[PDB]
Design a protein around this ligand. Structure first.
Ligand SMILES: CC(C)(C)c1cc(NC(=O)NCc2ccccc2Sc2ccc3nnc(-c4ccccc4SCCO)n3c2)n(-c2ccc(O)c(Cl)c2)n1
Ligand SMILES: Fc1ccc(-c2c[nH]nc2-c2ccnc(F)c2)cc1
Length: 325
């Protein structure tokens, strides 16, 4: 048990071990930048706000801890440490998560190549653990001075980067919803403008269909909902735009990958794994240095437990934590 020290910053109380110094707020749980005396490196510390407030909060607390303990990849946020000032389960009411400080978020062709390659390399790893990020956007991508990138999950509207099938409320979306988001981020980096700046879910889908066209016959037959089909099929039919004309001036290899990431039918979108092998990343692609994840147990997601059961499982996860070397 290390020595903790209490301190208030931005209406939030922070109780951290002595090893963490120079606590500076970055944004509000709530996050602080700090200096790790044990390693000599700058860290990011997330304090979970009211972790066991409800069954939802308690399960969410457990979910984030389980995810962060599992992620061990260069392009994904990982855990340096996890702690609590509580010395017992009974007392256990706060969770603090420690990671590498990158310094900034995401909001040259070689730059876009390097940045998107890193997203895809991190996304190949997350997707291999049967995880869907669901909220890839520039503010969920931590970037250091060296332009090295890490995928995380922390105003720039979420809806702008969301796959059209999610706007349409399809319950059976796949991992390619994340590939869509990558396509939206890549287009924005190449042009300097939000590809689809929808004001709401209806406007968002209108903007998407303007670029990718209205569904073709093969996709239309996959839509079970009568109301979704009535709405979509009542819109004026629109062809898929020529991406070479829309992204005029961009490297034609970047246009080719954009077309593969932004295909309307999710079943026809390129995967992170296939995208990493795309000609656009020839300067970076190494099939022997694009690892996959160890199996991730997400069976807990289907369970309905009491707050104290989620609290106790979280507590065991704090205790069992083993730092990286
Ligand atoms: C594995 C997956 C991607 C699916 C994922 C990740 C998360 N949760 C987090 O990423 N939580 C954030 C976090 C945890 C511990 C310590 C800090 C932070 S936030 C952070 C981390 C590193 C970093 N480096 N630089 C900055 C920074 C400094 C200033 C300005 C911007 C930035 S980066 C942009 C965000 O601040 N850093 C900030 N989850 C997950 C799962 C379940 C949940 O309920 C939640 Cl909330 C998250 N899933
Ligand atoms: F206007 C539309 C119509 C279909 C999509 C869409 C893209 N990929 N998948 C779907 C989809 C949606 C609902 N049910 C399905 F089976 C598949 C997106 C926008």
């Amino acid at each position: 048990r290390p020595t903790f020290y209490r301190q208030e910053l931005n209406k939030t109380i922070w109780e951290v071990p002595e090893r963490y110094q120079n606590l500076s707020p970055v944004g509000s749980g709530s996050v602080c930048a700090a200096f790790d005396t044990k390693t000599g490196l700058r860290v990011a510390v997330k304090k979970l706000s009211r972790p066991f407030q409800s069954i939802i909060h308690a399960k969410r607390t457990y979910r984030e801890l389980r995810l962060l303990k599992h992620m061990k990849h260069e392009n994904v946020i990982g855990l340096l440490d996890v702690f609590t000032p509580a010395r017992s389960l009974e007392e256990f009411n706060d969770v603090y998560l420690v990671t590498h400080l990158m310094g900034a978020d995401l909001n040259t062709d070689d730059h876009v190549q390097f940045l998107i390659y890193q997203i895809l390399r991190g996304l190949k790893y997350i997707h291999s653990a049967d995880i869907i990020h669901r909220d890839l956007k520039p503010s969920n991508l931590a970037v250091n001075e060296d332009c090295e990138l890490k995928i995380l999950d922390f105003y720039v509207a979420t809806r702008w980067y969301r796959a059209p099938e999610i706007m349409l409320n399809w319950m059976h979306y796949n991992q390619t919803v994340d590939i869509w988001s990558v396509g939206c981020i890549m287009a924005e980096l190449l042009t300097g403008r939000t590809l689809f700046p929808g004001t709401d879910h209806i406007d968002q889908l209108k903007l998407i269909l303007r670029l990718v066209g209205t569904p073709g016959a093969e996709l239309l037959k996959k839509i079970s909902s009568e109301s979704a089909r009535n709405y979509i099929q009542s819109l004026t039919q629109m062809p898929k735009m020529n991406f070479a004309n829309v992204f005029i001036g961009a490297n034609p290899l970047a246009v080719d990958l954009l077309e593969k990431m932004l295909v309307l039918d999710s079943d026809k979108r390129i995967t992170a794994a296939q995208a990493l092998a795309h000609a656009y990343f020839a300067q970076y692609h190494d099939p022997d240095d694009e690892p996959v994840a160890d199996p991730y147990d997400q069976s807990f997601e289907s369970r309905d437990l009491l707050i104290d059961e989620w609290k106790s499982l979280t507590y065991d996860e704090v205790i069992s934590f083993v730092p990286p070397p």
